[PDB]
Amino acid sequence: SKGEELFTGVVPILVELDGDVNGHKFSVSGEGEGDATYGKLTLKFICTTGKLPVPWPTLVTTLVQCFSRYPDHMKQHDFFKSAMPEGYIQERTIFFKDDGNYKTRAEVKFEGDTLVNRIELKGIDFKEDGNILGHKLVYNLDNVIVSDYFDYQDALDEIRETEKFDFAAIALPEAVIKWKYASGNIDYRYRMIVLRPGEGLAGLVIRTGSRKIVEDVDTELSQNDKLGCPIVLSEALTALVAIPLWKNNRVYGALLLGQREGRPLPEGSTTFRVNQRLGSYTDNGIKANFKIRHSIEDGGVQLAYHYQQNTPIGDGPVLLPDDHYLSVQSELSKDPNEKRDHMVLLEFVTAAGITLGMDELYK
Numbered sequence: 001s002k003g004e005e006l007f008t009g010v011v012p013i014l015v016e017l018d019g020d021v022n023g024h025k026f027s028v029s030g031e032g033e034g035d036a037t038y039g040k041l042t043l044k045f046i047c048t049t050g051k052l053p054v055p056w057p058t059l060v061t062t063l064v065q066c067f068s069r070y071p072d073h074m075k076q077h078d079f080f081k082s083a084m085p086e087g088y089i090q091e092r093t094i095f096f097k098d099d100g101n102y103k104t105r106a107e108v109k110f111e112g113d114t115l116v117n118r119i120e121l122k123g124i125d126f127k128e129d130g131n132i133l134g135h136k137l138v139y140n141l142d143n144v145i146v147s148d149y150f151d152y153q154d155a156l157d158e159i160r161e162t163e164k165f166d167f168a169a170i171a172l173p174e175a176v177i178k179w180k181y182a183s184g185n186i187d188y189r190y191r192m193i194v195l196r197p198g199e200g201l202a203g204l205v206i207r208t209g210s211r212k213i214v215e216d217v218d219t220e221l222s223q224n225d226k227l228g229c230p231i232v233l234s235e236a237l238t239a240l241v242a243i244p245l246w247k248n249n250r251v252y253g254a255l256l257l258g259q260r261e262g263r264p265l266p267e268g269s270t271t272f273r274v275n276q277r278l279g280s281y282t283d284n285g286i287k288a289n290f291k292i293r294h295s296i297e298d299g300g301v302q303l304a305y306h307y308q309q310n311t312p313i314g315d316g317p318v319l320l321p322d323d324h325y326l327s328v329q330s331e332l333s334k335d336p337n338e339k340r341d342h343m344v345l346l347e348f349v350t351a352a353g354i355t356l357g358m359d360e361l362y363k
Contacts, residue, residue: 001319003084004075007036007067012114013043015063021123022100022133024053030063032345034115036081039069041347046340054123055137056343057294060330061306062092062104064117065148068326068349078351079286079310079321085110086314093276094292095162097303100126109313131294131302138295141330145352145361147290148308149323150279155289156183158305159257159277164266167235167258170245170278171202177253179231184258189234201229202254205244209251212242215265231256238262241269246284253281276307286310286321325357326350 015030032043045056045063066080066088080088087109094102106119126133147154156168160183169182169190176197179190198207204226205212214220217238220227232240237258245253255274259265279287288308293301312318326349333344 001082001317003066003086004078004081006084006110007034007081010035011067013041013064013117014111014114015043015045015117015119017045017059017063017119017121019054019059019121019123021053021102021121022126022128025049026053028052028059028063030117034064034067036067037069039067039349041067041345041349043345043347044335044342045345046338046342048340050341052341054132055135055294056139057137057141057332058094058096058102058132058304060141060332060345061094061292061304062102062106062119062121063345064108064115065326065349066108066115068351070351074324074351074353077319077321077324079319080108082319083312083314086312086316088313089309089311091309091311093307095158095305095307096126096130096132097162097305099130099132099302100124107313131296131300136296136298136300137302138297140295140332142293142295143329144292144327145357146326146328148288148326149321149354150287150289152181152278153183154291155278155307156181158289158291159255159274160184162305163257163269163272165257166260166263167237167256169231169235169256169258170281171206171254171256173253177202177206179256182235185235187234190231193230193234195230201227201231201240201242201256205242205254206251209244209246211244213265213270214240214242216262232258236260239265241265241272243272243274243283245274245278245281247280247282249284255281276309279307279309323354325352325354327352327357 011034017028019026026049030045070078090106092104102123104121160168167184172180239259243255274283292304329348331346
């Protein structure tokens with residue numbers, strides 16, 4: 001609305017981070033300027049508790065999208081600037097592939113005439129030898145195009161690759177029940193065919209609000225002709241787990257995790273958490289998800305899966321966003337005259353329509 005006028009000039013940034021990773025606590029303080037008309041951030045961050053227990057590039061995403069430069073046609077959808085000055089809360093989960101996770105809560109708001117990002121972070125389940133605690137990541141950050149609109153397919157890709165399944169799909173109402181999204185699919189017939197209410201695997205799990213587990217699909221087909229759901233036959237599932245999805249403490253949909261070719265359910269599939277991986281839909285605000293590639297110094301790429309929630313702080317009206325991208329240019333630098341573990345950051349963040357972004361990333 002009118003929080004945009006606060007960003008016409010140069011704006012001072014102040015950043016505070018409170019962190020605790022596997023019990024190792026640390027603090028980071030940040031200082032600099034932001035030019036929103038150019039999407040520009042100039043910042044210096046210092047670890048004021050000693051050595052940073054984790055690598056600097058893993059905290060960049062955590063360390064103010066209200067400074068993105070939105071092209072003229074898109075300004076009408078600038079949510080972050082519209083939540084200003086009252087602010088917004090950024091809650092985030094970052095899963096480091098085959099390693100632990102960050103959970104972060106951040107208040108972003110104007111303090112006087114300075115934009116302040118105040119962050120609290122708890123990281124758990126990290127490997128002592130692992131890429132993170134081992135400090136095996138290259139000090140840089142790939143210039144990237146990033147989502148900032150969620151996308152259930154990328155969430156399903158994450159879940160599939162993480163629980164090491166071959167197939168995943170989500171059933172939602174359209175109000176009957178369609179299999180809307182799927183990852184690892186080999187056909188699209190799961191969407192082309194829709195069952196009447198209560199019918200099928202999704203119908204069962206929604207009606208009963210309880211998981212169904214099939215260790216071997218063929219043998220159970222010998223008991224119940226039902227289990228021959230269109231999804232099961234279309235994707236040739238030999239084992240599967242079907243989970244109920246909530247969000248209103250009322251059963252709303254279904255998550256299907258499937259295996260192929262007599263390969264068995266990975267260990268502990270029985271006890272699986274959708275936790276915060278599906279935005280609105282739970283296990284039992286503006287959501288987004290994306291993925292970050294951290295170069296490993298001794299050759300490699302460490303993945304960081306990001307799940308995002310942004311809620312305005314005030315009660316006044318805020319602009320709502322459409323589906324868009326963020327083109328981010330990052331430069332990681334060091335202050336030659338700084339004895340403390342630190343980071344110099346120069347950044348440019350530009351908003352992009354889904355077209356001008358698909359065309360670059362995938363075409």
